[PDB]
Amino acid sequence: SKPMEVYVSAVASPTKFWVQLIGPQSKKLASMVQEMTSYYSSAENRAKHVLTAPYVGQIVAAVFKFDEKWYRAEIVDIMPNQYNPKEQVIDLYFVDYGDSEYISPADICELRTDFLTLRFQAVECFLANVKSTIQTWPKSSIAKFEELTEVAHWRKLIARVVTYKERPRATTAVSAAAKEGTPLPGVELFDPADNSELNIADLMITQGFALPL
C-alpha cells in the first residue's frame, strides 16, 4: 500500500492509537471544528438541537470542557449518575480524534445534519512489529511513543499499512466500528523531519522501549 501523511491524534499505547489523514480532509476537519464550536456556543442554537432520550450508537455534538470546543461524538455507553439516579453519564467516543470521555448530558446536543457529511476522521491503529518490554506497556514506553509522535500537536508523520490484526474481544465500551473480529491496521510510522533513517518502531526497539516481534 501507499505511504500517507498523517497526524497521530490520540494515544492509549503503541498498540492502540488513532491517526488522521493530512490533506483536504484535515483542512475540512479544522473548518468543521471551528464552525461547530461557533454554532453550538449559542444557547439559541443549542435549543434547536436539545438532546432527548439518547441511545448507544447515536452521533451527537459534545463540548469537551478542556478546550471548550465542540466535537462529533458517538455514544458508546449510558449509565446512571451514581450520586443521582435521575440523570445519566454518557460515554462518548470522539469520532474525529479517537479520545473517549464520560460526559454529562448537559454538555451534549443533537448533531446538525450537514455536520455528518465529512468522513469520521480518526482511524485506530497499532504500531507494527513491536511488543512490550515487560510481559501492558510500561508508562515510559507510552510516554516515549507520545513524544515521538507528538500526539495532538499537528506533527506530520508518514504512515504505511503493512499488516492487520483481528480485534480482540473488548473489555470496555468501544465504537460500533470497532467490534471483535474487525481488522485493526498495523502501521509503520516515521517522522520526515526527524534527522533519522529509522522509523518509530525501530527507534523504540533500539532505545529499549519495545521488543521486536
Short mmCIF file of C-alpha atoms in Angstrom, two decimals, residues 68-193:
data_model
loop_
_atom_site.label_atom_id
_atom_site.label_comp_id
_atom_site.label_asym_id
_atom_site.label_seq_id
_atom_site.Cartn_x
_atom_site.Cartn_y
_atom_site.Cartn_z
CA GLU A 68 -14.25 24.48 25.10
CA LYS A 69 -14.60 23.22 21.51
CA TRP A 70 -17.49 21.19 20.07
CA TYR A 71 -16.83 17.77 18.57
CA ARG A 72 -18.64 14.97 16.78
CA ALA A 73 -19.08 12.03 19.11
CA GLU A 74 -20.58 8.54 19.20
CA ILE A 75 -22.46 7.38 22.29
CA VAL A 76 -20.86 4.09 23.29
CA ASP A 77 -22.46 3.64 26.73
CA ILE A 78 -25.05 5.23 29.01
CA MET A 79 -25.24 4.71 32.77
CA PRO A 80 -26.93 6.34 35.73
CA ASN A 81 -25.19 9.11 37.62
CA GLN A 82 -24.12 7.41 40.94
CA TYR A 83 -24.86 10.42 43.03
CA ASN A 84 -28.03 10.99 41.19
CA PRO A 85 -30.20 8.23 39.68
CA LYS A 86 -32.44 10.55 37.60
CA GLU A 87 -29.55 11.72 35.42
CA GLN A 88 -27.23 9.76 33.15
CA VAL A 89 -23.50 9.76 32.47
CA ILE A 90 -22.66 9.32 28.77
CA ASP A 91 -19.58 7.52 27.46
CA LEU A 92 -18.56 9.32 24.23
CA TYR A 93 -16.10 8.25 21.53
CA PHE A 94 -14.81 11.34 19.67
CA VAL A 95 -15.04 10.02 16.11
CA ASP A 96 -12.65 12.52 14.51
CA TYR A 97 -9.86 12.26 17.12
CA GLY A 98 -10.03 8.91 18.94
CA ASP A 99 -10.44 10.07 22.54
CA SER A 100 -13.12 8.66 24.82
CA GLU A 101 -14.64 10.67 27.68
CA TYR A 102 -17.53 10.34 30.13
CA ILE A 103 -19.65 13.47 29.77
CA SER A 104 -22.78 14.93 31.34
CA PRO A 105 -25.84 15.22 29.04
CA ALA A 106 -25.77 18.95 29.85
CA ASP A 107 -22.75 19.15 27.53
CA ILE A 108 -24.29 17.30 24.56
CA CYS A 109 -26.61 18.31 21.69
CA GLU A 110 -28.03 16.58 18.66
CA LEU A 111 -25.75 16.98 15.63
CA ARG A 112 -26.96 19.33 12.87
CA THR A 113 -27.47 17.05 9.88
CA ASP A 114 -24.97 18.65 7.50
CA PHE A 115 -22.14 18.11 10.03
CA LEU A 116 -22.46 14.38 9.25
CA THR A 117 -21.09 14.75 5.70
CA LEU A 118 -17.37 14.57 6.50
CA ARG A 119 -15.85 11.09 6.85
CA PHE A 120 -15.16 10.22 10.50
CA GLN A 121 -11.52 11.25 10.65
CA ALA A 122 -9.83 9.01 13.26
CA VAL A 123 -8.59 5.52 12.44
CA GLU A 124 -7.49 3.22 15.26
CA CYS A 125 -4.12 1.55 14.55
CA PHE A 126 -1.33 -0.35 16.19
CA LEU A 127 2.40 0.06 15.60
CA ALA A 128 3.54 -2.94 13.57
CA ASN A 129 6.42 -5.24 14.56
CA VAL A 130 6.71 -4.27 18.24
CA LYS A 131 5.69 -5.67 21.61
CA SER A 132 6.05 -4.57 25.22
CA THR A 133 9.36 -4.93 27.08
CA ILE A 134 7.55 -6.35 30.11
CA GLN A 135 5.02 -9.18 29.99
CA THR A 136 0.56 -3.93 29.08
CA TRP A 137 3.12 -1.29 28.10
CA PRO A 138 5.33 0.45 30.67
CA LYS A 139 4.37 4.08 31.24
CA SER A 140 7.83 5.06 29.97
CA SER A 141 7.14 3.29 26.66
CA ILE A 142 3.78 5.01 26.27
CA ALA A 143 5.44 8.35 27.05
CA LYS A 144 8.22 7.76 24.53
CA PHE A 145 5.66 6.94 21.85
CA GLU A 146 3.67 10.09 22.71
CA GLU A 147 6.91 12.08 22.40
CA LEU A 148 8.00 10.59 19.08
CA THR A 149 4.55 11.10 17.57
CA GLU A 150 3.99 14.46 19.33
CA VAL A 151 0.39 13.35 19.71
CA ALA A 152 -2.27 16.06 19.29
CA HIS A 153 0.22 18.78 18.24
CA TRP A 154 -0.13 18.53 14.46
CA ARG A 155 3.17 16.76 13.79
CA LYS A 156 3.27 15.28 10.30
CA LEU A 157 4.27 11.62 10.12
CA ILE A 158 4.44 9.23 7.17
CA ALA A 159 2.39 6.09 7.79
CA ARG A 160 2.15 2.87 5.82
CA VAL A 161 -0.24 0.00 6.47
CA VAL A 162 1.83 -3.20 6.46
CA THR A 163 -0.40 -5.69 8.30
CA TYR A 164 -3.78 -6.24 10.01
CA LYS A 165 -4.80 -7.90 13.26
CA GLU A 166 -8.18 -9.18 14.35
CA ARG A 167 -9.65 -7.01 17.07
CA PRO A 168 -9.72 -8.82 20.42
CA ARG A 169 -12.88 -9.11 22.50
CA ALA A 170 -13.49 -5.71 24.10
CA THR A 171 -13.44 -5.41 27.89
CA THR A 172 -14.78 -1.85 27.81
CA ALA A 173 -17.31 0.10 25.74
CA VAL A 174 -15.97 0.91 22.28
CA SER A 175 -17.13 2.29 18.94
CA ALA A 176 -19.66 0.36 16.85
CA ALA A 177 -16.96 0.46 14.17
CA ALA A 178 -14.54 -1.36 16.49
CA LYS A 179 -16.20 -4.70 17.26
CA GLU A 180 -14.48 -8.04 17.84
CA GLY A 181 -13.31 -9.64 14.59
CA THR A 182 -12.90 -6.40 12.65
CA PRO A 183 -9.48 -5.58 11.16
CA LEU A 184 -7.12 -3.27 13.04
CA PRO A 185 -4.46 -1.77 10.72
CA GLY A 186 -0.82 -2.22 11.73
CA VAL A 187 1.33 0.65 10.53
CA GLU A 188 4.89 1.77 10.12
CA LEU A 189 5.45 5.38 11.17
CA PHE A 190 8.26 7.73 10.57
CA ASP A 191 8.94 11.39 11.09
CA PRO A 192 10.17 13.04 7.86
CA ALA A 193 11.63 15.94 9.83
#
